Write a protein that binds this ligand. Structure first.
Ligand code: NA
Ligand code: NA
Ligand code: NA
Ligand code: NA
Ligand code: NA
Lengths: 163, 156
């Protein structure tokens, strides 16, 4: 299969944060993603643990229970920024955070993700996850909410809504 | 600290399901686990993907967003079954499903886990996790809720 990069990955708080996209997808439960026919891409946040991750994840593990908001802005565009809240889901290549998105035509875009840890009050998955704190099996505190940004160009006859 | 085994792992639906226990733990957020001072063990369900997992997980990945109920019963003895729901959490050896439990003294116990997929009506994480279904990136349907059982000898 093929996917497309948004910039290059960034390493922060013991994690690799990468932005990628592919064609719009379909998901179970149905009717939660924007319809694939009304979208240009499926945008994703690919988040995996680095070596010696402070929260106990082995290197390469997917980091679960995060909440990710995104803002996509067209450089020099007359449109309002594109925003949304990703959802965690599994595909044939494993779990991701993603969302189906409709863009504003070909051009340069700024992409900003805001990543919330699993103890943030803004993260609706926080009631479902814990962290050991005892001496023998405990880990370091969760990272604080942070953002990451990339620039990328979306353009071409082979790009849906990019020509 | 020792991680004690509860039987041997069992393989179903493209996953390894293993049971272990250790001493009671402390967790953030506080007030969800039974106090460590009022518990005997921390029981865990260790669930990881096997090769060719049908739901898209690479081999060895933790299987996330499941919901696990347990029933622990002192074998052929006085006492009611001990029941509860585990919680997903991370520790220094990675993520698990687990719970602090008070037992009924040394002896043999049956341990049964009932494992609910992300789309089960009993799984509270159903509004928060999806599965791709399109032809190019989709995976097979979720497994149906099932149980696995073992026994172990608690020494203290
Ligand atoms: Na909480
Ligand atoms: Na066994
Ligand atoms: Na088996
Ligand atoms: Na706490
Ligand atoms: Na045993």
């Amino acid at each position: 299969m093929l996917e497309y990069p948004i910039g290059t990955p960034q390493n922060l708080a013991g994690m690799e944060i990468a932005a990628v996209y592919l064609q719009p997808i379909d998901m179970e439960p149905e009717g939660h993603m924007r319809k694939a026919s009304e979208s240009d891409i499926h945008i994703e946040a690919d988040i995996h643990a680095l070596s010696n991750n402070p929260n106990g994840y082995p290197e390469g593990f997917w980091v679960p229970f995060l909440f990710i908001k995104y803002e996509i802005t067209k450089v020099g565009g007359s449109g309002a920024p594109i925003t949304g809240d990703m959802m965690a889901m599994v595909a044939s290549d494993g779990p991701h955070y993603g969302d189906n998105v409709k863009l504003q035509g070909p051009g340069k875009y700024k992409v900003k993700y805001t990543i919330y840890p699993p103890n943030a009050k803004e993260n609706p998955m926080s009631p479902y996850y814990g962290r050991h704190t005892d001496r023998e099996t405990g880990v370091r505190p969760w990272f604080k909410t942070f953002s990451v940004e990339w620039d990328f160009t979306y353009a071409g006859i082979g790009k849906k809504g990019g020509y």
